[PDB]
Amino acid sequence: CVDLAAEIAKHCGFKYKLTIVGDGKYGARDADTKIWNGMVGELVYGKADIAIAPLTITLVREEVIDFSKPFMSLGISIMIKKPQKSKPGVFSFLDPLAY
Amino acid sequence: GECGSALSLSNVAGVFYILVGGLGLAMLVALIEFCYKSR
Amino acid sequence: MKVGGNLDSKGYGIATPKGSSLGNAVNLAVLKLNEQGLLDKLKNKWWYDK
Amino acid sequence: MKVGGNLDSKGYGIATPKGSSLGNAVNLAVLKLNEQGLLDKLKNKWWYDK
């Protein structure tokens, strides 16, 4: 997204400052207070003029901010720890019996 | 809600035991008839 | 390891405050960059090339 | 049998001649039908129900 930001800035002809989101969040609206945090809050409260990040296009976000057409496609997925099929001893040959 | 390979030495090791008592007695009777009857 | 299919299908977009004048031009820039094949090269560069 | 994951991720849309006046109203109808949960029921009906 740094390279993408450079490309976008070139194609649209603007100077930009990369700022790390204060809270390290993508952006969510506090239920009760209705306050957006993260980069969404940065846009909502005028702390930044554009967001160039892995910001998921969502309905609740599209209700409060504008999105370009998708530049990347993804889905929720599952990560598991790696496992090894093969593990070798000496006499596991003998292990069915005990010392 | 709060609720949501090995080896058994013992089992026949007993039969080891019994087998061995069988051994000792077997030899007892053995040398008691050998000594007793023979001599 | 990633196991199974994805649970949903969506994308990332460039977001602006509602009614920002950049939004349209940024969107068209994104369209050009997609149409140039740049995004596949950049994805390979940052995911798989190393 | 379907093997592996999908190679891409996309969808079907209702298409109109460019500048057709139906496009907007049809699109909002589609949005409502999605929001009603009708499409999942119809998909079950024509894919799996039989």
Q: Which residue of D has its CA nearest to A73?
A: D9
Tell me how far the alpha carbon of residue A46 is from its chain's centroid.
22
Binding-site residues of A for L-glutamate, in ranges, read 54, 56, 61
What burial letters (b/e) apply to C7-26, b meaning 16+ CB within 10 Å? eeebebbbbbbeebebbebb
DSSP-derived secondary structure letter, A79: E
Contact A75, C8 (CB under 8 A): yes
- What's the CA gap between A83 and C1, in Å, rounded? 10
**A54 contact residues in C (CB cutoff 8 A):** 12
| Residue ranges of D 1-50 with Cβ closer than 8 A to chain A | 8-9
For CA atoms D28, D33, D37, D41, the dihedral sign is negative
**Could you identify the residue written with the tokens 């990633």?**
C2
At C47, list the tokens.
């995911």
Residue listed under structure tokens 């070139």? A10
This entry's atomic model was obtained through cryo-EM
Q: Phi and psi (nearest 5°) for B2?
A: -105, 5
Contact between A75 and C6 (Cβ < 8 Å): yes
**Secondary structure class of D12 (helix, strand, coil):** coil
Tokens encoding B29: 């009777």
